Amino acid sequence: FIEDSEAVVAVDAVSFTLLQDQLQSVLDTLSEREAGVVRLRFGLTDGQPRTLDEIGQVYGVTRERIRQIESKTMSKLRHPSRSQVLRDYL
Amino acid sequence: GGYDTPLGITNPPIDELLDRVSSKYALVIYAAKRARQINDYYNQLGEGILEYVGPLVEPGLQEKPLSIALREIHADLLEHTEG
Amino acid sequence: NPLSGLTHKRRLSALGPGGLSRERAGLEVRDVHPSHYGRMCPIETPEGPNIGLIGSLSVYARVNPFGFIETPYRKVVDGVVSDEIVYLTADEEDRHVVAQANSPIDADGRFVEPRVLVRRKAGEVEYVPSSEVDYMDVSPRQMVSVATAMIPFLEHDDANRALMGANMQRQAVPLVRSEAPLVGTGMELRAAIDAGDVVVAEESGVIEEVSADYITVMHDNGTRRTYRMRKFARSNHGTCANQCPIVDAGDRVEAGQVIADGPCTDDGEMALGKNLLVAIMPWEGHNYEDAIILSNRLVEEDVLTSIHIEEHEIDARDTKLGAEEITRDIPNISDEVLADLDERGIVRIGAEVRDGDILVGKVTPKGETELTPEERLLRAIFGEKAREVRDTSLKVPHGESGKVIGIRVFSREDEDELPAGVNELVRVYVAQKRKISDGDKLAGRHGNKGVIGKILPVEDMPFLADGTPVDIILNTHGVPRRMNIGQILETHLGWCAHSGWKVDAAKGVPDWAARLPDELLEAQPNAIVSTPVFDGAQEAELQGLLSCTLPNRDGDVLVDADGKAMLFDGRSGEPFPYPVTVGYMYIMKLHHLVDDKIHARSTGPYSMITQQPLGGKAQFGGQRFGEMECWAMQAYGAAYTLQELLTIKSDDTVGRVKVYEAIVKGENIPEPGIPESFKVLLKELQ
Amino acid sequence: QETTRVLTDAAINCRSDKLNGLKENVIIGKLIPAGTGINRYRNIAVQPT
Amino acid sequence: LISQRPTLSEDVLTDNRSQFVIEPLEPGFGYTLGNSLRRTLLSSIPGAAVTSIRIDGVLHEFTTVPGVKEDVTEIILNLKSLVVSSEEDEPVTMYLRKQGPGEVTAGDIVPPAGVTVHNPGMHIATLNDKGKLEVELVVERGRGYVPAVQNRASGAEIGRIPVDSIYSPVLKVTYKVDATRVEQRTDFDKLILDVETKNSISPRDALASAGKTLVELFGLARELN
Amino acid sequence: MLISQRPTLSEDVLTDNRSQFVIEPLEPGFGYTLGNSLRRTLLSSIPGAAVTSIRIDGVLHEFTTVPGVKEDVTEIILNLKSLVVSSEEDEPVTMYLRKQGPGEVTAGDIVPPAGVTVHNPGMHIATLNDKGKLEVELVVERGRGYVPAVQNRASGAEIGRIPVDSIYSPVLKVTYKVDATRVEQRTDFDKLILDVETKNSISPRDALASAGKTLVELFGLARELNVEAEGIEI
Amino acid sequence: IPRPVKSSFREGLTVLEYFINTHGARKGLADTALRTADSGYLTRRLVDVSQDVIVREHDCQTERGIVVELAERAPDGTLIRDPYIETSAYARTLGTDAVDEAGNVIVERGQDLGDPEIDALLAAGITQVKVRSVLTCATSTGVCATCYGRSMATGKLVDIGEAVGIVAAQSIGEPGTQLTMRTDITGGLPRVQELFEARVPRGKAPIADVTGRVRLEDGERFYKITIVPDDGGEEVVYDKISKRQRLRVFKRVLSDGDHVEVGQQLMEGSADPHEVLRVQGPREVQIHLVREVQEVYRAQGVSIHDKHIEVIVRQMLRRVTIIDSGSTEFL
Amino acid sequence: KLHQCGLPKLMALELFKPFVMKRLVDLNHAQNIKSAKRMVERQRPQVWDVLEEVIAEHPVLLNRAPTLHRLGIQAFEPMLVEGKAIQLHPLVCEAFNADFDGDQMAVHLPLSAEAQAEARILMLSSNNILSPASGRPLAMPRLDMVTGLYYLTTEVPGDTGEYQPASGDHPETGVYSSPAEAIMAADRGVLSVRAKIKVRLTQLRPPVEIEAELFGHSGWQPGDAWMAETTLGRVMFNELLPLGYPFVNKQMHKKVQAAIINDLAERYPMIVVAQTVDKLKDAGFYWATRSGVTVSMADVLVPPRKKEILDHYEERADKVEKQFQRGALNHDERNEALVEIWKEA
Ligand SMILES: [Mg+2]
Ligand SMILES: [Zn+2]
Incomplete structure (x- = not known):
């Protein structure tokens, strides 16, 4: 008669996979290499975030440009067309 | 054979279905495999065309794949081999 | 109900510490030895796996100081029945010889016929002469319990259905009206003043003042006393326990008088149910195999309608990471659902709630767990913070709705007695007005019972010639084979008690009414009557009363001498070709309502060591697909369904998420793997 | 019935189960060898005519 | 062939309850007429x-x-x-x-x-x-x-x-027929309907509203061609 | 007041003179209320x-x-x-x-x-x-x-x-049968199904129309007491 | 109780008569409650035993089978339908072609022995039929299809794969609650229990061993009645057998000099299955088991086709005992 | 219907939650799965129209513990029912051993195509009519329904509108040209349902003897016409049974209906048996309402001779007691004698 909080609740897994696919789709609809800089910054493929030094190292660029890219990409995703298919997940 | 027309889960009648196969177990597996085939035809429609075909008979507005499979069975549109 | 409170006490249980258990219980202990007569009722025992192990004391029983059960008896010396009542245990009942109360005493203590019904030592029944009788029963219905003594026409009922009636007379729920029965016994009044749930005027006096909350009585000598009521107090099983007064501001009361009715009391006496117009025909198959149909009339006028009060509780304890707080600062939920909550957590009184609503805003710390990358991205996209605290609020469980009567909040700050490591406790009382519906269990006083098959409208119900629709329709096929025709007799007398009779004793008294008591040759409409258990309405007296049943408003004797009436089909229109039995039957509402029983689960909590679903309806819970159902599915040849029900709905830990995903995405159900039961068995074997 | 003695003397005999009844196929969760589980019906090839 | 259309004579008994009498009707019809009017009055009177x-x-x-x-x-x-x-x-x-x-x-x-x-x-x-x-x-x-x-x-x-x-301003509705049924086959029914309302509207108004509801619902079946 | 949903009337023709009329969705429970009157009127009113x-x-x-x-x-x-x-x-x-x-x-x-x-x-x-x-x-x-x-x-x-x-009677056999029909979520509205068999004198559609005429006249004789009474307009 | 109750429930019982009725009422209720558990245990054991009885082959091509009565004869030469034919013969595949006085083969090997078939067989005048059944089915692991006969639910030949064993076990276990007890022969559900459990009955009644007249050794308070051998060589001197129980009657009671059969029941009661096996073979012990179970089930008016009890009994008589090892591996 | 069953929508919504979630995601009523789940939990009224779609032709299983035998679990096609109680078809009460005292049943849900096919073909209600034990029907009408059919088909001599062959002054006045005319005469107060009349039937097969008499070999019924002296009730029973079945013309004792349904299941396909059983259910309930079977104390008549009976056996009981008192027999013998005396009484 004891439940298991440490267990797959079987809606979290499918919801989480759907969130994954939808977030990948919305990231793909973004711009080219800048959505991927967001992907690296939040670590959507490598599993670790890495910092502006590493993003500049892999791309051959500076860090202020990276932060500007982050802010520019971040502004668009607050706009409803990207958010409407993503808001319900949070 | 003058039965009143069936409705719902009993269409087609199982007695006319049983003349196509040996036993009702064979009907069960028949319809299950065919319904699965129809389901993944519906799933694999977005991408390129593969070896799966169906539904050969025209379904309804919204129809479960198993009902389509059993109706195809009754219409003599499939063949099989047992184990 | 108050009767169940009275009958839980006065109960004899043969099981427990120092006594035999049910597995150690033989068959010979569960019978009725002939020494039970007057010391323990042979009717009322639980019907489940406890029959005979649990019974109750008789009405007149008294306990010997050495723990034995004495019983009163009227001593008769040399054939004059005296009044010296002497108490004997079973031994002196063996030694001496016992007569019967329903014997012809000739108004002098003297018997009439020498040849008399009598019990001997070993339970034998013979015909001793009217000279060796030394002891006599105090009254009939001495062998019977309290609850069973409240069944009219009990002597016509079979012992099985009498047992059922006694066991389900204690399961009625307190209705909002609680109308007293028409036909009853003498134990409707004394089973309520003794049960305790009826406020009794301790000492005589005049009423100073009344309200819905208290009664101030003025005693004859200076002193005044305030009796406080108990309004809408929750019982131990979720039912209401209202106590409203029945006295006025100028009335004079005596000591021992009922001054305020209780949960199931009406002007002093017990009322567990309502008087309903009953027909005994089989109607359209809706009253098939013990099913009962009702009128919508019982739904419209709240005839059968209980007020169920449920108690929810939540405590703000201490924890390793810190302390939780009952607050409005909850993590992600729209402010739409925070409208009902007051400024510091718990809901406002009177705010109606549905299933899954928030009752007590309570949030706990969580610590630091590294987020999934996509959670981090989605949080930063909307700018929302981590919100390190985790919400475990008191959500009202599924399948429940109703108002909120009262909120009782403790605190450590007021220095209340709380257990160790608990900061703030709070209980919320949520009540709902459960009406009658299709599926609730209804029952009379003679073991009849049934789920309600259908609530018809008032127009499609067989109505009498005067347009009065019947209220419920029982079935006929359940009457003769269960040998409980008391419900028929209680029906007939019920009609006689409703229309009122008048025996026109113009030329003497009619033959049947010769031994009727006075002021029974005529009665008023809706006049209450009572038949004691083993001396009640004789069948000839029922025929005589039913013969003269003076008309309602016009010249119209709706129910003829046979006890039947010409019903009109309210649905089709044609009159029914044969007359149908109609009457007024007293019927309760049992505590087996649908809302307590309906249950469903698609996915929910899971067990601890084995990974099976939980059960019991307290959680979501699932039904046990046991061994016998496994055999039944094997016999069909059903292989894949059995594989499903034993692998991917119970134990395939990696497979259940796969089946949910495959259903949501519209794919095919994945093939089952090995269950988490066989693997636990394998590891235990290793 | 009598799980202890059956288990211990089976362990002594090293008795290998063959998994061919309707109960040992239910315990381990694979398809039972009756009804729609036998190879005559479990291995039907279904193609459109 | 019987050709006389029925009448709807009225009889006041109290302020709230009254009887209506409809005659002559076709045989085997008064029960169904009374039941139709009862089921309408007892359920669908605004x-x-x-x-x-x-x-x-x-x-x-x-x-x-x-x-x-x-x-x-x-x-x-x-x-x-x-x-x-x-x-x-x-x-x-x-x-x-x-x-x-x-x-x-x-x-x-x-x-x-x-x-x-x-x-x-x-x-x-x-x-x-x-x-x-x-x-x-x-x-x-x-x-x-x-x-x-x-x-x-x-x-x-x-x-x-x-x-x-x-x-529901209506309170109690009954009826009874007196079928003459003479051996010469000039048979006709006689519907004596009874209405008791709960002092909200007079029984005449309740019966009129029931009749108009029935007229509106049976114009559906009548209006075909 | 409003009917809140307009009932229809559609027929299935089985033989030359054999029909299955369906009326849906009748306001509950008007199915019986009009069905029994219709059945008796068809068999016993049409000349x-x-x-x-x-x-x-x-x-x-x-x-x-x-x-x-x-x-x-x-x-x-x-x-x-x-x-x-x-x-x-x-x-x-x-x-x-x-x-x-x-x-x-x-x-x-x-x-x-x-x-x-x-x-x-x-x-x-x-x-x-x-x-x-x-x-x-x-x-x-x-x-x-x-x-x-x-x-x-x-x-x-x-x-x-x-x-x-x-x-x-030109009609020979009418059997009425009500059923259950969903409206929004009510799932209780009454669907009436009539099986009408006539002889080859008149069509069943015309028989139903004439019976509806007679019934609407009878219930208009009922109506014509206070014409300005409120109730249920379709 | 010798009083007895003399009032109907319409007239209303008195106090003592009602108190007397309560005895039987409560006794019956508790007895029913225990009978549920008894039936459940019987069902579980029969399910375990009959688990591996599943139809595997369409036909085993055997020719051995049982003989069924099928409307035995009357002194007037009239065939009276045997009182239990809808349960014993009906829906069982005939194995030997029934010939009526060299008339014709009314039904051939391969028919289902249905109702019109039985009417034809009765019209033809034949009574004893040889039918194929699950005791004689010559498969290896699981009965064939033509020996089981007709699946009772479907109405056709049982499909290859159906688990007839669990159907049999459930069909014998469900009417274990309708079946009641009574009054030293056990005559209720415990009788069926001691039958399927194959225990020596508490009212054991030893049977004959050889034919011949009887040497009536009646003793005091017990009967040690010997049986003179017809051709045998020794008379079976029996021992103390309580004279309280009576003697089995046939033809008259067991009387001195009466000719007994090879396995005639001497005294009155129930025989054990072990002795009747050892004396008269598996065929006779199978007939005894089926007849004795169906006698109990017929007494309560419960219709059970014999093929279910037949599957159970076939599961009983599988193995053999080793009296001589030969020289190979058998203890 | 026999294959159908009730299912409370408040419970079907929880059984079919993933199916309805997917479907109302597909119909663009929700942006994603999470909004769909919240919409399901708040039960917005459009969740019921989609619930009807996801339920149609998707069987559920109805277990009742204790599952004594194979028919304790059966597959029904679910339908939505107002209320919270599962509506069970009355004809499976014998199989489930389920009266209506408050007995509960568990609904299970098959998921895969294999499991749905097994529920739909193997474990459907209309495919399991007969017992697995003896082949007798368990979908046979019982109880209330048997009373209805008995009252429907019983024959009452001296009833209203019989056939009599008296002539000279007036003709026979018992003949009816068609069952429609008989039904008309029954709606009027002329013909009682249980009167002996002569009807001209054109849609029912006559018994074997009459068929061999009037037509001999190949009398096909949908066109041919034939006379029958029967009750209107037996006709009204016989058009329920299929066309190919001959006329019965008997009084429907329960065993008669058992034999009829046994023959019907042995010779005809299963769907015909299911539909005939459903028709019998409808007629049985409808005419059990009209049978006027009630229980009143004026209905329960006592035997008038009972007192003389009790005296005649009390004298023998008194004789036995006196013989025990004087001492010719012991206690057990007088107990046995009294027992036999009261069994005779
Ligand atoms: Mg029950
Ligand atoms: Zn074989």
Whole structure:
């Protein structure tokens, strides 16, 4: 008669996979290499975030440009067309 | 054979279905495999065309794949081999 | 109900510490030895796996100081029945010889016929002469319990259905009206003043003042006393326990008088149910195999309608990471659902709630767990913070709705007695007005019972010639084979008690009414009557009363001498070709309502060591697909369904998420793997 | 019935189960060898005519 | 061939109950005619009844008012027996103030224009020196039994006690036929229908409304070509 | 008030004269309320005509068998009752049937005087043999319902005239059956299903229309007490 | 109770008569409650035993089978339908072609022995039929299809794969609650229990061993009745057998000099299955088991086709005992 | 219907939650799965129209513990029912051993195509009519329904509208040309349902003897016409049974209906048996309402001779007691004698 909080609740897994696919789709609809800089910054493929030094190292660029890219990409995703298919997940 | 027309889960009648196969177990597996085939035809429609075909008979507005499979069975549109 | 409170006490249980258990219980202990007569009722025992192990004391029983059960008896010396009542245990009942109360005493203590019904030592029944009788029963219905003594026409009922009636007379729920029965016994009044749930005027006096909350009585000598009521107090099983007064501001009361009715009391006496117009025909198959149909009339006028009060509780304890707080600062939920909550957590009184609503805003710390990358991205996209605290609020469980009567909040700050490591406790009382519906269990006083098959409208119900629709329709096929025709007799007398009779004793008294008591040759409409258990309405007296049943408003004797009436089909229109039995039957509402029983689960909590679903309806819970159902599915040849029900709905830990995903995405159900039961068995074997 | 003695003397005999009844196929969760589980019906090839 | 169309003669018995007699009819038809009219009258006659009450001192339905002998739910049960007839379809409201000892009758209710209370002699509650009962009632029109409308579905202001409404001015309907059925086959039925209303509208108006409902529903079947 | 959903009426034609009407969704529970009235009105209101009495020669007291025919008096009677004939006269017109010689007699063999028409073409009403002779004077009068054989309409004056039963109703069998139909989430509205079987005199659609006319007139006689009364307008 | 009750429930019982009725009422209720558990245990054991009885082959091509009565003869030469034919013969595949006085083969090997078939067989005049059944089915692991006969639910030949064993176990276990007890022969559900459990009956009644007249050794308070051998060589001197129980009657009671059969029941009661096996073979012990179970089930008016009890009994008589090891591996 | 069953929508919504979630995601009523789940939990009224779609032709299983035998679990096609109680078809009460005292049943849900096919073909209600034990029907009408059919088909001599062959003054006045005319005469107060009449049937197969008499070999019924002296009730029973079945013309004792349904299941396909059983259910309930079977104390008649009976056996009981008292027999013998005396009484 004891439940298991440490267990797959079987809606979290499918919801989480759907969130994954939808977030990948919305990231793909973004711009080219800048959505991927967001992907690296939040670590959507490598599993670790890495910092502006590493993003500049892999791309051959500076860090202020990276932060500007982050802010520019971040502004668009607050706009409803990207958010409407993503808001319900949070 | 003058039965009143069936409705719902009993269409087609199982007695006319049983003349196509040996036993009702064979009907069960028949319809299950065919319904699965129809389901993944519906799933694999977005991408390129593969070896799966169906539904050969025209379904309804919204129809479960198993009902389509059993109706195809009754219409003599499939063949099989047992184990 | 108050009767169940009275009958839980006065109960004899043969099981427990120092006594035999049910597995150690033989068959010979569960019978009725002939020494039970007057010391323990042979009717009322639980019907489940406890029959005979649990019974109750008789009405007149008294306990010997050495723990034995004495019983009163009227001593008769040399054939004059005296009044010296002497108490004997079973031994002196063996030694001496016992007569019967329903014997012809000739108004002098003297018997009439020498040849008399009598019990001997070993339970034998013979015909001793009217000279060796030394002891006599105090009254009939001495062998019977309290609850069973409240069944009219009990002597016509079979012992099985009498047992059922006694066991389900204690399961009625307190209705909002609680109308007293028409036909009853003498134990409707004394089973309520003794049960305790009826406020009794301790000492005589005049009423100073009344309200819905208290009664101030003025005693004859200076002193005044305030009796406080108990309004809408929750019982131990979720039912209401209202106590409203029945006295006025100028009335004079005596000591021992009922001054305020209780949960199931009406002007002093017990009322567990309502008087309903009953027909005994089989109607359209809706009253098939013990099913009962009702009128919508019982739904419209709240005839059968209980007020169920449920108690929810939540405590703000201490924890390793810190302390939780009952607050409005909850993590992600729209402010739409925070409208009902007051400024510091718990809901406002009177705010109606549905299933899954928030009752007590309570949030706990969580610590630091590294987020999934996509959670981090989605949080930063909307700018929302981590919100390190985790919400475990008191959500009202599924399948429940109703108002909120009262909120009782403790605190450590007021220095209340709380257990160790608990900061703030709070209980919320949520009540709902459960009406009658299709599926609730209804029952009379003679073991009849049934789920309600259908609530018809008032127009499609067989109505009498005067347009009065019947209220419920029982079935006929359940009457003769269960040998409980008391419900028929209680029906007939019920009609006689409703229309009122008048025996026109113009030329003497009619033959049947010769031994009727006075002021029974005529009665008023809706006049209450009572038949004691083993001396009640004789069948000839029922025929005589039913013969003269003076008309309602016009010249119209709706129910003829046979006890039947010409019903009109309210649905089709044609009159029914044969007359149908109609009457007024007293019927309760049992505590087996649908809302307590309906249950469903698609996915929910899971067990601890084995990974099976939980059960019991307290959680979501699932039904046990046991061994016998496994055999039944094997016999069909059903292989894949059995594989499903034993692998991917119970134990395939990696497979259940796969089946949910495959259903949501519209794919095919994945093939089952090995269950988490066989693997636990394998590891235990290793 | 009598799980202890059956288990211990089976362990002594090293008795290998063959998994061919309707109960040992239910315990381990694979398809039972009756009804729609036998190879005559479990291995039907279904193609459109 | 019998060719005389039936009549609808009337007979007043009391102020609220009356009999109607329809003759002559085709044989084997009076029972079905009476049942049709009964099932219409007893179910689908539009009326008016109280739906929600708001007492000042109560937050919900399961509490008590200080001073009144009665409690809130029995006040609900007593007001559920009220009879009231409106004229307009907006959810009108009426008030009721009472201070001091005495019985609170339905005549103490002050209604606005249009609505009226047809039985001032109804016992609602009884008070004392400390008693003070203020309540507002919401009357609307409708038909049949509607259950209590949940407060959340409504404006959801805490205190609006919702009450089951029964919009049925009819109270009891019966009938009986007197089929002559002579051996010469000039047979005809004779429907003696009976209507008793609960003093909201006269039985004539209830029967007229039932007849118009039936006319409107059978014009559906009549109008084909 | 508003009906809140308009009921429809659609028919399935099964045979030439056989229909299955469906009405959906009737406001609950109006299914029975109008269905029973419709069933009784169809069978017992629509006017029609049939043979009410017949006189045969050679049958005066022993109504057992008729000279020259294969069948008996009862068979001729039940064959004549099933005959459908229209009519335009309140008075009991007299059909004359007269055929001599062998062979069977058709339903069209009877001469129709002007007006009254024999809708059934050739239904076997007698089998004259041995070069027989048959002469029935039939009496046809219009009516409604099923008036049983009028026992001694006179004092048995025309002893040859045998009073037969009379199926006046053009429709022969109506069975009503309500069901359950979903509206929004109510799942309780009443769907009425009528199975109507008539003879080849009139179409079932026209029979239903005429019965609806008669019922709406009767309930308008009910209505015309206070015309300005509120209730349920569709 | 020798009083007895003399009032109907319409007239209303008196106090003592009602108190007397309560005895039987409560006794019956408790007895029913225990009978549920008894039936459940019987069902579980029969399910375990009959688990591996599943139809595997369409036909085993065997020719051995049982003989069924099928309307035995009357002194007037009239065939009276045997009182239990709808349960014993009906829906069982005939194995030997029934020939009536060299008339014709009314039904051939391969028919289902249906109702019209039985009417034809009765018209033909034949009574004893040889039918194929699950005791004689010559498969290896699981009965064939033509030996089981007709599946009772479907109405056709049992499909290859159906688990007839669990159907049999459930069909014998469900009417274990309708079946009641009584009054030293056990005559209720415990009798069926001691039958399927194959225990020596508490009222053991030893049977004959050889034919011949009887040497009536009646003793005091017990009967040691010997049986003179017809051709045998020794008379079976029996021992103390309580004279309280009576003697089995046939033809008259067991009387001195009466000719007994090879396995005639001497005294009155129930025989054990072990002795009747050891004396008269598996065929006779199978007939005894089926007849004795169906006698109990017929007494309560419960219709059970014999093929279910037949599957159970076939599961009983599988193995054999080793009295001589030969020289190979058998203890 | 026999294959159908009730299912409370408040419970079907929880059984079919993933199916309805997917479907109302597909119909663009929700942006994603999470909004769909919240919409399901708040039960917005459009969740019911989609619930009807996801339920149609998707069987559920109805277990009842204790599952004594194979028919304790059966597959029904679910339908939505107002209320919270599962509506069970009355004809499976014998199989489930389920009266209506408050007995509960568990609904299970098959998921895969294999499991749905197994529920739909193997474990459907209309495919399991007969017992697995003896082949007798368990979908046979019982109880109330048997009373209805008995009252429907019983024959009452001296009833209203009988056939009599009296002549000379008036004809027979018992003949009816068609069952429609008989039904008309029954709606009027002329013909009682249980009177002996002669009807001319054109849609029912006559018994074997009459068929061999009038037609001999190949009398096909939809066109042919034939006379029958039967009750209107037996006709009204016989058009329920299929066309190919001959006329019965008996009084429907329960064993008669058992034999009829046994023959029907042995010779005809299963769907015909299911539909006939459903028709029998409808007629049985409808005519059990009209049978006027009630229980009143004026209905329960006592035997008038009972007192003389009790005296005649009390004298023998008194004789036995006196013989025990004087001492010719012991206690057990007098107990046995009294027992036999009262069994005779
Ligand atoms: Mg039960
Ligand atoms: Zn075989």
